[PDB]
Amino acid sequence: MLVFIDDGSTNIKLQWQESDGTIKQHISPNSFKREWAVSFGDKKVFNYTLNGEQYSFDPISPDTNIAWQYSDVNVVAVHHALLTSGLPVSEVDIVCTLPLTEYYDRNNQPNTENIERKKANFRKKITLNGGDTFTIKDVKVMPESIPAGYEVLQELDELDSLLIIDLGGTTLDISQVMGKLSGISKIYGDSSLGVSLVTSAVKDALSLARTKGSSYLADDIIIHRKDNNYLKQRINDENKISIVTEAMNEALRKLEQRVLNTLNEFSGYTHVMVIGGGAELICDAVKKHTQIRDERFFKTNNSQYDLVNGMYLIGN
Amino acid sequence: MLVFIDDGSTNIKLQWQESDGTIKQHISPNSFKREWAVSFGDKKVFNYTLNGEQYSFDPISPDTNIAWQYSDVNVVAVHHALLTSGLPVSEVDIVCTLPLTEYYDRNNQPNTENIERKKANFRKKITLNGGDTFTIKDVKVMPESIPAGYEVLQELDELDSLLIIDLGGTTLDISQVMGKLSGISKIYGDSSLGVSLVTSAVKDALSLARTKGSSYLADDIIIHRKDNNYLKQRINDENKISIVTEAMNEALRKLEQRVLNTLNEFSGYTHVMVIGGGAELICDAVKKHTQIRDERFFKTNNSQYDLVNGMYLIGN
Amino acid sequence: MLVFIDDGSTNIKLQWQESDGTIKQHISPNSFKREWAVSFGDKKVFNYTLNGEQYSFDPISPDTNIAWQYSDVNVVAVHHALLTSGLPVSEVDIVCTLPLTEYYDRNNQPNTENIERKKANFRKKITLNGGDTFTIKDVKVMPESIPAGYEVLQELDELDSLLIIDLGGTTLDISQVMGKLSGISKIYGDSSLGVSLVTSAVKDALSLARTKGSSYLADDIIIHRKDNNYLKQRINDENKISIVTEAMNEALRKLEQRVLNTLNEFSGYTHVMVIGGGAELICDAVKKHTQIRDERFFKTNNSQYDLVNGMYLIGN
């Protein structure tokens, strides 16, 4: 079994193909705490032991990004993603990830130590309380932006170029790739903002415990921000709805504000693709800004999985 | 009379100066129950009435942190600390405290409502059974980490920076301050762990009533964990000694595990200081990790009072 | 009040004259982030709101150049420079700048849209948290290289010519001007390299956060690169000192390598002047190369302010 895993620090995206040929996609959050969760009978808990420490999954408080890729939690979050993927527990080969400006140097040349360190990380032994864990055998690396735009690039003429805009949890990366992946025109990495900007705006708009715990609430609000029906039910307070909406919009305005300034650094692209968890949040602005024709603008309603699905399709 | 009071939710630390110029330090625990304690003649009891409720000091069961700063118990715990400080009962002016991430906003800019709410709290009338209570007149606020490192910072060159590591009862906060308090380089607040981790590990290692009552026992064990002589006398059971020691060490390993990961978020510091009640518990690890020279590593054997002593020295 | 402002994208240089006739010079960095910095009491913060967005000054990570001249940050960086200049907050008239190859066309003829766009930029409303901002009323444009060499040119005979070498943050511009500003002999604009080359070499030599934040550290090292005493104190690691010095020198060798090739494009000059932030870094090489006599070679120890001081002297 081969599983493609885009283990981002906000969400882990999984992709693999079944015996019947169907291609599966899964997303598991990076929400864990350094202690087992106790259950007296009604709550199903995931209690892990990674090196010596015990960990457990849970909707904790949202609080390095880079350090995380080689952390014990990363390993736990990945196994957990496997365990909750629906896949049968087994030995598995995986392909994981390390960002555009990390994979490529300043001259857009692919950039050993970090890579072997990444591989070595899944060499850590994990155990699940009252259950069995998958066995990670072989562990390939792919750049982030590119795999998501590949099936479109195949169709592009060598002279046209896809502008890929990825809005992640804590970074916004934009790249411009020549048709038929015949070259990387430009890469712009910006680790100063991501969806977490909006997330924290919501956790504050509603005095919310700044922990991964409330991240599910914050997410529901951001996602259903245009449906007052949903908002009313999720938020039992009428006053807090107008407030969260104002705070949510200023944060959104900041996102759109920046992606737009950055797009002015790119020119000559013929096609546009928006990916990442927050793709939906800046989609309209960039479409408007770039003024690219509908048939050349790419977006999906599963944006957080566009990368790992693209990776899956390439190396399946 | 002016008393500097660092009223933490685990221990209240007092600092003030006498007529003869000697600077005094006192520590009183936050151990109270909602009911008067009855004494028929041999036990001295402290029975208070705060708003309408009666409270009494006692070694209760260890069981919000934030809510506590504006609670009726806080007021009681402070008065009690005054009453047991050795100071003569009188009208007094005080300086109390509110944490690094509360005192400073995200841009390390000092952060009104909470502050006035804090002051207003000591406006609550208290009475002592068979005795007189101090009278709290004026009530200044200081950030937590900084005051403890100030007298060292004065000696530091504007380019060097002190890394202050505070291990409290339920949180671990680390900050990096530029020499001569010429700027705050970084603040890392982590409310997920504190000494209470070890404390609860001990109360469980010895089926102990999880209440502030046994906290004195748990404390004695943690403190004398390296002296089998003391442990044997405090623990009449030989078997429970090896057990408590194993549970105590796993908890310690977790503390050291985390402070170390966090220190990897800090860089460029030239001096290191460890403070807070649990300073002694992570002292060796951070010294080893940071590999700072002995003459630049700061620790005391009164760590729980480093903050209030520092506050005392500044605003005496 | 009239202030001459050379707002470069690395450093803003200010020049103006006081009532008592003394001519003042100030330099403020272009270091800001898109979010207010929070202070709980010890750090003085500068929190701005420019159009709708909030900005704050801070030593951020070093990451268009051209786009910056018409950006909201530019406005913020200028106001901030005014606020920290020592000047009393007031309504002020300013003269700002737009580079040699922008001010002059290919035939060295002065080159409307950009100019009005520049002026219009300071028309943006700004506010300071807990403070008042200056009021920008009238907003003249001067070429970059020339103003710095004017007081020397006045003394030059119409046949002699000053070779002005400006090493800025991201560009190196050289021009040759006839005595008594009687004509521009040649202009060579090179936007491929600047001091940022050395800067990034240092941030990498010391795994440093590539952000404007560490720019102050990188700067201190470059400036004190010949004093091991300073380097030892600024760098607590002995090993990192030899490394940063080797990386710093290769970058310097590249700078000297290029200015020298470029100087071979110029001939007939009788006097030489080196200006800009990095003047100090290539000063020795060009002096050696051109072999101009000491009394005809011009350099100062305030090179980053030579341009705005020259502008000040002309239009005061």
mmCIF file of N, CA, C and O in Angstrom, chain B residues 40-80:
data_model
loop_
_atom_site.group_PDB
_atom_site.id
_atom_site.type_symbol
_atom_site.label_atom_id
_atom_site.label_comp_id
_atom_site.label_asym_id
_atom_site.label_seq_id
_atom_site.Cartn_x
_atom_site.Cartn_y
_atom_site.Cartn_z
ATOM 1 N N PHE B 40 -11.324 23.240 68.953
ATOM 2 C CA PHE B 40 -11.734 23.119 70.347
ATOM 3 C C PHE B 40 -10.614 23.435 71.333
ATOM 4 O O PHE B 40 -10.715 23.103 72.510
ATOM 5 N N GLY B 41 -9.538 24.056 70.860
ATOM 6 C CA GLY B 41 -8.476 24.408 71.779
ATOM 7 C C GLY B 41 -7.018 24.213 71.412
ATOM 8 O O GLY B 41 -6.164 24.928 71.935
ATOM 9 N N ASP B 42 -6.691 23.269 70.537
ATOM 10 C CA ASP B 42 -5.279 23.089 70.225
ATOM 11 C C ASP B 42 -4.819 23.561 68.850
ATOM 12 O O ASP B 42 -3.628 23.806 68.641
ATOM 13 N N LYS B 43 -5.747 23.706 67.912
ATOM 14 C CA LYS B 43 -5.361 24.150 66.575
ATOM 15 C C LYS B 43 -5.702 25.616 66.343
ATOM 16 O O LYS B 43 -6.815 26.063 66.626
ATOM 17 N N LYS B 44 -4.727 26.371 65.855
ATOM 18 C CA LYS B 44 -4.952 27.783 65.566
ATOM 19 C C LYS B 44 -5.592 27.793 64.185
ATOM 20 O O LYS B 44 -5.054 27.206 63.247
ATOM 21 N N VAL B 45 -6.744 28.437 64.062
ATOM 22 C CA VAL B 45 -7.439 28.468 62.780
ATOM 23 C C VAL B 45 -7.607 29.889 62.260
ATOM 24 O O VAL B 45 -7.633 30.838 63.041
ATOM 25 N N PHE B 46 -7.703 30.028 60.937
ATOM 26 C CA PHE B 46 -7.892 31.327 60.291
ATOM 27 C C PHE B 46 -9.223 31.290 59.588
ATOM 28 O O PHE B 46 -9.344 30.728 58.498
ATOM 29 N N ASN B 47 -10.223 31.887 60.228
ATOM 30 C CA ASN B 47 -11.573 31.903 59.699
ATOM 31 C C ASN B 47 -11.963 33.284 59.252
ATOM 32 O O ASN B 47 -12.070 34.216 60.048
ATOM 33 N N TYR B 48 -12.178 33.389 57.950
ATOM 34 C CA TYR B 48 -12.510 34.640 57.305
ATOM 35 C C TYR B 48 -13.936 34.721 56.801
ATOM 36 O O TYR B 48 -14.627 33.716 56.647
ATOM 37 N N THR B 49 -14.366 35.944 56.546
ATOM 38 C CA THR B 49 -15.679 36.194 55.997
ATOM 39 C C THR B 49 -15.284 37.209 54.950
ATOM 40 O O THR B 49 -14.687 38.231 55.285
ATOM 41 N N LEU B 50 -15.576 36.930 53.688
ATOM 42 C CA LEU B 50 -15.146 37.839 52.639
ATOM 43 C C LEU B 50 -16.230 38.764 52.120
ATOM 44 O O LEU B 50 -16.101 39.977 52.183
ATOM 45 N N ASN B 51 -17.301 38.215 51.583
ATOM 46 C CA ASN B 51 -18.350 39.095 51.106
ATOM 47 C C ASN B 51 -19.567 38.819 51.969
ATOM 48 O O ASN B 51 -20.232 39.723 52.471
ATOM 49 N N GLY B 52 -19.865 37.536 52.101
ATOM 50 C CA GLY B 52 -20.993 37.088 52.895
ATOM 51 C C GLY B 52 -20.593 35.702 53.347
ATOM 52 O O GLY B 52 -21.014 35.206 54.399
ATOM 53 N N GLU B 53 -19.732 35.096 52.529
ATOM 54 C CA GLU B 53 -19.208 33.753 52.753
ATOM 55 C C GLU B 53 -18.078 33.707 53.758
ATOM 56 O O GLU B 53 -17.348 34.684 53.938
ATOM 57 N N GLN B 54 -17.945 32.556 54.409
ATOM 58 C CA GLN B 54 -16.881 32.341 55.365
ATOM 59 C C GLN B 54 -15.858 31.454 54.652
ATOM 60 O O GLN B 54 -16.205 30.614 53.809
ATOM 61 N N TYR B 55 -14.591 31.706 54.934
ATOM 62 C CA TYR B 55 -13.512 30.932 54.343
ATOM 63 C C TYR B 55 -12.531 30.614 55.448
ATOM 64 O O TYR B 55 -12.538 31.249 56.497
ATOM 65 N N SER B 56 -11.689 29.622 55.228
ATOM 66 C CA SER B 56 -10.686 29.307 56.224
ATOM 67 C C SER B 56 -9.495 28.721 55.517
ATOM 68 O O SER B 56 -9.632 28.089 54.474
ATOM 69 N N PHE B 57 -8.321 28.960 56.072
ATOM 70 C CA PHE B 57 -7.110 28.428 55.489
ATOM 71 C C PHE B 57 -6.996 26.964 55.878
ATOM 72 O O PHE B 57 -7.500 26.566 56.931
ATOM 73 N N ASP B 58 -6.356 26.168 55.025
ATOM 74 C CA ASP B 58 -6.137 24.748 55.313
ATOM 75 C C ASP B 58 -5.510 23.988 54.166
ATOM 76 O O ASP B 58 -5.652 24.362 53.013
ATOM 77 N N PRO B 59 -4.799 22.902 54.477
ATOM 78 C CA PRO B 59 -4.177 22.103 53.414
ATOM 79 C C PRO B 59 -5.249 21.230 52.732
ATOM 80 O O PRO B 59 -5.396 20.043 53.053
ATOM 81 N N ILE B 60 -5.994 21.842 51.802
ATOM 82 C CA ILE B 60 -7.063 21.170 51.065
ATOM 83 C C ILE B 60 -6.581 20.370 49.883
ATOM 84 O O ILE B 60 -5.388 20.178 49.673
ATOM 85 N N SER B 61 -7.561 19.947 49.095
ATOM 86 C CA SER B 61 -7.355 19.151 47.901
ATOM 87 C C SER B 61 -7.009 20.012 46.687
ATOM 88 O O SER B 61 -7.638 21.045 46.453
ATOM 89 N N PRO B 62 -5.984 19.610 45.912
ATOM 90 C CA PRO B 62 -5.589 20.372 44.726
ATOM 91 C C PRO B 62 -6.534 20.081 43.563
ATOM 92 O O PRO B 62 -6.630 18.944 43.100
ATOM 93 N N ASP B 63 -7.238 21.115 43.108
ATOM 94 C CA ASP B 63 -8.191 20.989 42.002
ATOM 95 C C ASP B 63 -7.880 21.929 40.838
ATOM 96 O O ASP B 63 -8.727 22.157 39.965
ATOM 97 N N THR B 64 -10.743 28.000 37.811
ATOM 98 C CA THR B 64 -9.891 28.461 36.718
ATOM 99 C C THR B 64 -8.688 29.158 37.305
ATOM 100 O O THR B 64 -8.655 29.481 38.493
ATOM 101 N N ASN B 65 -7.690 29.395 36.472
ATOM 102 C CA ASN B 65 -6.512 30.075 36.952
ATOM 103 C C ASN B 65 -6.812 31.558 36.822
ATOM 104 O O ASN B 65 -6.682 32.331 37.775
ATOM 105 N N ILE B 66 -7.226 31.925 35.614
ATOM 106 C CA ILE B 66 -7.549 33.299 35.258
ATOM 107 C C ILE B 66 -8.650 33.885 36.125
ATOM 108 O O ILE B 66 -8.522 34.996 36.632
ATOM 109 N N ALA B 67 -9.735 33.137 36.284
ATOM 110 C CA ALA B 67 -10.864 33.584 37.089
ATOM 111 C C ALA B 67 -10.438 33.905 38.521
ATOM 112 O O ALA B 67 -10.983 34.814 39.155
ATOM 113 N N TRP B 68 -9.447 33.164 39.013
ATOM 114 C CA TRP B 68 -8.947 33.335 40.373
ATOM 115 C C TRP B 68 -8.438 34.742 40.704
ATOM 116 O O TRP B 68 -8.601 35.211 41.836
ATOM 117 N N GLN B 69 -7.832 35.412 39.728
ATOM 118 C CA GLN B 69 -7.293 36.748 39.955
ATOM 119 C C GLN B 69 -8.333 37.786 40.372
ATOM 120 O O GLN B 69 -7.984 38.818 40.942
ATOM 121 N N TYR B 70 -9.605 37.509 40.093
ATOM 122 C CA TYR B 70 -10.687 38.434 40.450
ATOM 123 C C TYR B 70 -11.675 37.778 41.409
ATOM 124 O O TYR B 70 -12.800 38.256 41.565
ATOM 125 N N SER B 71 -11.250 36.693 42.052
ATOM 126 C CA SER B 71 -12.109 35.948 42.967
ATOM 127 C C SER B 71 -12.039 36.401 44.407
ATOM 128 O O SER B 71 -11.094 37.066 44.821
ATOM 129 N N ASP B 72 -13.050 36.008 45.175
ATOM 130 C CA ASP B 72 -13.111 36.342 46.595
ATOM 131 C C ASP B 72 -11.996 35.625 47.349
ATOM 132 O O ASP B 72 -11.491 36.129 48.354
ATOM 133 N N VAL B 73 -11.622 34.444 46.870
ATOM 134 C CA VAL B 73 -10.564 33.682 47.519
ATOM 135 C C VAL B 73 -9.231 34.414 47.381
ATOM 136 O O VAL B 73 -8.436 34.462 48.335
ATOM 137 N N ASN B 74 -8.987 34.985 46.203
ATOM 138 C CA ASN B 74 -7.752 35.724 45.964
ATOM 139 C C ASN B 74 -7.562 36.742 47.083
ATOM 140 O O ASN B 74 -6.498 36.826 47.698
ATOM 141 N N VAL B 75 -8.611 37.511 47.341
ATOM 142 C CA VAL B 75 -8.586 38.530 48.385
ATOM 143 C C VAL B 75 -8.234 37.889 49.729
ATOM 144 O O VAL B 75 -7.377 38.391 50.457
ATOM 145 N N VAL B 76 -8.884 36.772 50.040
ATOM 146 C CA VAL B 76 -8.640 36.048 51.286
ATOM 147 C C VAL B 76 -7.201 35.533 51.386
ATOM 148 O O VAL B 76 -6.548 35.638 52.437
ATOM 149 N N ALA B 77 -6.716 34.962 50.289
ATOM 150 C CA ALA B 77 -5.362 34.433 50.248
ATOM 151 C C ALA B 77 -4.322 35.528 50.445
ATOM 152 O O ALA B 77 -3.267 35.291 51.042
ATOM 153 N N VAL B 78 -4.606 36.725 49.934
ATOM 154 C CA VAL B 78 -3.674 37.845 50.073
ATOM 155 C C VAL B 78 -3.670 38.343 51.519
ATOM 156 O O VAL B 78 -2.613 38.467 52.135
ATOM 157 N N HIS B 79 -4.848 38.624 52.062
ATOM 158 C CA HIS B 79 -4.947 39.061 53.446
ATOM 159 C C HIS B 79 -4.255 38.049 54.345
ATOM 160 O O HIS B 79 -3.461 38.408 55.220
ATOM 161 N N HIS B 80 -4.555 36.775 54.122
ATOM 162 C CA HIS B 80 -3.958 35.729 54.930
ATOM 163 C C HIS B 80 -2.440 35.802 54.858
ATOM 164 O O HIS B 80 -1.759 35.636 55.872
#
